[PDB]
């Protein structure tokens, strides 16, 4: 809630099990917290529609997890890419060559 200044890992300790959807969401924010250099904040958001049974499995699977959130980090790079290229388009579009 008001303790949105610190990290989410700290929230975990300061957030009961029912506070899942709050802080770590499923378990997203914490994993992407390590991959925060990108934008963990918004990443968890989109991928928040993930399973709760898989959330636990993610924290137990460094290989299977990081692989999933790996793409998550990419969804961000594309998120700000297709968003800025809205009205700020200088280059021409594709031609209808069939």
């Amino acid at each position: 809630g008001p303790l949105g200044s610190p990290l989410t890992a700290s929230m975990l300790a300061s957030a009961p099990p029912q506070e899942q959807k709050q802080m770590l969401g499923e378990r997203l924010f914490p994993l992407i917290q390590a991959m925060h250099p990108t934008l963990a904040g918004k990443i968890t958001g989109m991928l928040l529609e993930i399973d709760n049974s898989e959330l636990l499995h993610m924290l137990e699977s460094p290989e299977s997890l990081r692989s999933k959130v790996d793409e998550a980090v990419a969804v961000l790079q594309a998120h700000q890419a297709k968003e800025a290229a809205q009205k700020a388009v200088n280059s021409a579009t594709g031609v209808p060559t069939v």
Binding site: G45, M46, E49
Partner: peptide, 22 residues
């Protein structure tokens, strides 16, 4: 629109409720 790759339901994070639950 903004299509995601991982989750097919890329939506903002709306706490309070268990988003992505059944």
């Amino acid at each position: 629109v903004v299509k995601s790759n991982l989750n097919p339901n890329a939506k903002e994070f709306v706490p309070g409720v268990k988003y992505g639950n059944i």
